[PDB]
A and B are shown apart, each in its own frame.
Chain A
Amino acid sequence: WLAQRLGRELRRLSDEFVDSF
């Protein structure tokens, strides 16, 4: 469970971050 939440948040942040390149 904890890991699924971490992954989703990481994914959220990654897609935000990639847009800022």
Chain B
Amino acid sequence: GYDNREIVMKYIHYKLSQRGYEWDASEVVHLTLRQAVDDFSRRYRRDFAEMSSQLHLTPFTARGRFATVVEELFRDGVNWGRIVAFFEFGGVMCVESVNREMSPLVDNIALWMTEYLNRHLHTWIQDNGGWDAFVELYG
């Protein structure tokens, strides 16, 4: 297995530097994932900007917002596209957190992403060849 916590941390750190923010916290996998999420981001750019504006992120709504969106995303199953959208969505929440002067939310979202990966996505990811199979498919 690849360490999903490390995959979350590297991706979130990457996304925040894309916005000019600097967040203190296998390389082929990290690069392939960031490329797929970037592609997805650019493909649906206007949609994600509109989502951002409706997020209404506060410390009291963030946890439930993350959980409800992610449970809907995977409601009837998992595939690699939904895994990419999951990283995109978590990244959008982290960006909104720093943009709204709630940068401590970033650390919480990263943990919620890591926890969802390990609690709900690990079996599917492993059953389907692990992150190496993602690299082979998106490469």
Contacts and interface: CB of A to CB of B under 8 A. Distances in A.
B29 interface: no
Contacts, number: 69
A2 B89 contact: no
Contacts of B81: 13-19, 21
Interface residues of B, number: 27
Contacts of A21: 80-81, 137-138
Given A14-B84, A21-B80, A4 B40 contact: no
**A contact patch SS:** helix
Chain A interface size, as a band, is: 10 to 19
Nearest to A13: B44
Interface of B: 40, 43-44, 47, 51, 54-56, 64-65, 68-73, 75, 79-82, 84-85, 88-89, 137-138
Interface of A: 2-4, 6-11, 13-19, 21
